[PDB]
Amino acid sequence: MPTLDALTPIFRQVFDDDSIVLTRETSANDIDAWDSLSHMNLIVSLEVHYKIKFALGELQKLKNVGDLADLVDKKLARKLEHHHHHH
Numbered sequence: 001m002p003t004l005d006a007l008t009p010i011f012r013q014v015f016d017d018d019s020i021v022l023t024r025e026t027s028a029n030d031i032d033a034w035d036s037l038s039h040m041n042l043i044v045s046l047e048v049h050y051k052i053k054f055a056l057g058e059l060q061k062l063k064n065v066g067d068l069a070d071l072v073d074k075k076l077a078r079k080l081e082h083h084h085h086h087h
Helices: 003-014 036-049 065-080
Strands: none
Touching: 003 036, 003 065
């Protein structure tokens, strides 16, 4: 799981910042900037970049960036399962 490493440039890009460093405990409550619209911006960035699919049921489980570290890596595990399509 090399996810938080890979995700830090992504979250810094979406939320347009330099001081954002990802930890498993960091959430929207830690980032005054992160709201519904910016959360959707975050997920669609993961959709295009890593080609990975999140379900709103899994968004119910995404309380922190640690939950993203899990989810992103599980989707990347589904990318080792030979179904490759670009965005």
